[PDB]
Design a binder for this molecule. Structure first.
Ligand SMILES: Oc1ccc2c(c1)OCO2
Length: 126
């Protein structure tokens, strides 16, 4: 069902949170080789999450689940903010700009946390 597909999408999201937190520790410790690998892994996870989310929104639309569509439109917009900040973080890493990396890292944490009440709201609406 779309609800089990959203639970699968939620788990992939949690996997990104887990990897993100081990990447943050690695960054703080200066282990740039680990950071590079974690950033690649996070890219894959975010790409996968985004794909699952679009499939869930499209299905909600085909099902005429207006409330779910509203919430998913808001959530996917927030997800794109996160993606843009993530890509800026990756660029800051490439450039060796640790001050920008620190900034972007904090911002991505705030975007992800704020989206969680909505994320929980979607689970109930599908
Ligand atoms: O990759 C993400 C970017 C922004 C988010 C998110 C995941 O869940 C809540 O908001």
């Amino acid at each position: 069902s779309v609800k089990s597909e959203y639970a699968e999408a939620a788990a992939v999201g949690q996997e990104a949170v887990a990897v993100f937190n081990t990447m943050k520790a690695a960054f703080q410790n200066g282990d740039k080789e680990a950071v590079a690998q974690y950033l690649a892994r996070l890219a894959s996870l975010y790409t996968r999450h985004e794909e699952l989310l679009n499939r869930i929104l499209e299905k909600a639309r085909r099902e005429g689940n207006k409330e779910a569509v509203t919430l998913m439109n808001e959530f996917t917009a927030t997800f794109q903010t996160g993606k843009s900040i993530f890509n800026a973080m990756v660029a800051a890493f490439k450039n060796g700009d640790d001050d920008s990396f620190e900034s972007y890292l904090q911002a991505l944490e705030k975007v992800t946390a704020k989206g969680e009440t909505l994320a929980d709201q979607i689970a109930k609406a599908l």
